[PDB]
Design a binder for this molecule. Structure first.
Ligand SMILES: [Ca+2]
Length: 158
């Protein structure tokens, strides 16, 4: 089992970490949603699907930078909603193919009233999402750590 981002970089068998650079709406009003869809960015596959079933969860999701200070939100994992930052592990998603399949994570972040001017700086760390992978075959229990960085500034008008 292994994963990769749309702009190249990979995390190998056994887990590890990688940076993901995401384009964000340049402006979002208080009470409107900023959507960070990682299904277009993070892909995973099963290396031996004839024999093994891989199980994948969102173990933990946390906010950093401007998202931590100026936004509240939820995370959608495989169509279901959870508070973000997370306090519980999600149900699993099954990976049973060599073909790259999206990791179905999306963040829904709404600016709080207090926000104004530049809320998210370009290049800043905005989230860490931990993908946890197990299987039906042995004791493998791996973390794939995705560090999410903003490609551009996000302005929240006062
Ligand atoms: Ca592949």
């Amino acid at each position: 089992f292994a994963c990769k981002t749309a702009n190249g970089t990979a995390i190998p068998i056994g887990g590890g970490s990688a940076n993901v650079y995401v384009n964000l709406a340049p402006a979002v009003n208080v009470g409107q949603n900023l959507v960070v869809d990682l299904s277009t960015q993070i892909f995973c596959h099963n290396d031996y699907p004839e024999t093994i079933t891989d199980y994948v969860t969102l173990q933990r999701g946390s906010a950093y930078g401007g998202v931590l200070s100026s936004f509240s939100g939820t995370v959608k994992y495989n169509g279901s909603s959870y508070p973000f930052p997370t306090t519980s592990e999600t149900p699993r998603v099954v990976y049973n193919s060599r073909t790259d399949k999206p990791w179905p994570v999306a963040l829904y972040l709404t600016p709080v009233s207090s926000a104004g001017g530049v809320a998210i700086k370009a290049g800043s760390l905005i989230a860490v999402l931990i993908l946890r992978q197990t299987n039906n075959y042995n004791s493998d229990d791996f973390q794939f750590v995705w560090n999410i960085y903003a490609n551009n500034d996000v302005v929240v008008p006062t």
